[PDB]
Amino acid sequence: QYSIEKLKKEENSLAKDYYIYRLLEKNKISKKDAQDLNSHIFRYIGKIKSELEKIIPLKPYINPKYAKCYTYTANTILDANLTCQSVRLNSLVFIASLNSKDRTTLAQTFKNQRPDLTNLLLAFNTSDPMSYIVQKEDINGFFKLYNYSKKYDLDLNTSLVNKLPNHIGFKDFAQNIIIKKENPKFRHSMLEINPENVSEDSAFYLGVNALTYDKTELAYDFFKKAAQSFKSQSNKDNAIFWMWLIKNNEEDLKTLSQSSSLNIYSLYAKELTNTPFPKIESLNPSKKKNNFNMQDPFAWQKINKQIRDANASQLDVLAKEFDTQETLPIYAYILERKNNFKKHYFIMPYYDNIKDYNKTRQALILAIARQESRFIPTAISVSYALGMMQFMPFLANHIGEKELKIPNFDQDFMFKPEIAYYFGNYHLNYLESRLKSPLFVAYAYNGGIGFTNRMLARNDMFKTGKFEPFLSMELVPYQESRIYGKKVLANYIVYRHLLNDSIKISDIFENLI
């Protein structure tokens, strides 16, 4: 481990944040060490921020220009200058705090110049501000009320719902209420959004919405607009899959089977059409090593930043330098960016550590590693999950110290491939014994078995139905876990194939129900 003085010498990075956090959690950062420390933190968010703030509380921040505006309360806002009045009325809580006569007075003041403020003031003078704002079709006001409180729910007419998608807040609004199965009147109302008025993820989610109300024609039209507008081929393919499942046009499935993206939907389309398995690149460097230390986390942060910022020309130099067995994960990382994400790389590094597991287990391990870290041994996430298998410190210490009693265990042992694969195996055994499906395991590996168990206990998730289990996979309530599962499942199919232990993805989908 490294003292605060030596860390200060390193470039700002997630690795440097991780090591500062370790000092903080062990109470080794004095108040004096803590003085200049927020300029030494690459991502001042979450636990490193709460820990530093127990030592040095946040004196900021209210802008010096409006400082005087924040000396007023609901009882004295009428004594404040007009600029201060308008600044404070940015907060709906502040508006809700005001007494009704002052809302009336302020509504008049602001009607000519800030009718937005007028609408919110007078809305809060009613027993249902949302209904007042909906009647005015004040779109900005609608999203401020939604962000103030999710409990407001009301039917929205065709005119109003068609205006919502032009606001930045629309996409997360639609996603949230559809995935969480909240705001039923809002949700039902969004059946009448013209597909011409939406695109990309919003259109896709409005398709999922339509399916939940069994409006299959509307759904198809939404998914078609999504397929046309989505930027990434992976997402287009997800949308084309729905177009096919709903209307059964064989041109759609054919297009999906010919996708350059390797994902569960293109894999499935290839399987349904007797199309051959996609070509997987074979990387077999003859050179054994270079000078690079695959166990130094600071070196990875540095080289990662280089690789990410390299022009197409410097990629070629990096490619050659890292074309060794020992740096195979970095080589494939470079190649993936060099070939503008067109080729399929599915490496198996430090394979000696897993060659004795059955092949199905090898594939699940490799599938998880590929998504978690791209096999970078010193990978560190923004939540300080560590190594190839991205263990959180808590779980790493529980397995390493309590369960396995490894002598002198430290959480940084997760940076060692032998340890990452071993702990991954151990943890995957726990999850698979309870959950069975590799997809369910993936969800639980990323989101925890608690969330997974709760999701699978619901009446409406992964049961029988027309569009199952595909519909359920779109309604997994955490975005990250929804995405993670699809990607890990694709990876799993591929590695099973490479290991000569093929399984039909159609069997995987049957076993989800």
Ligand SMILES: CC(=O)N[C@H]1[C@H](OC[C@H]2CCC(=O)N2)O[C@H](CO)[C@@H](O)[C@@H]1O
């Ligand atoms: C190094 C890192 O941040 N890993 C995270 C991974 O990031 C995907 C991309 C970016 C980094 C990389 O190599 N793969 O996404 C997972 C969720 O899908 C998380 O559980 C992992 O902790």
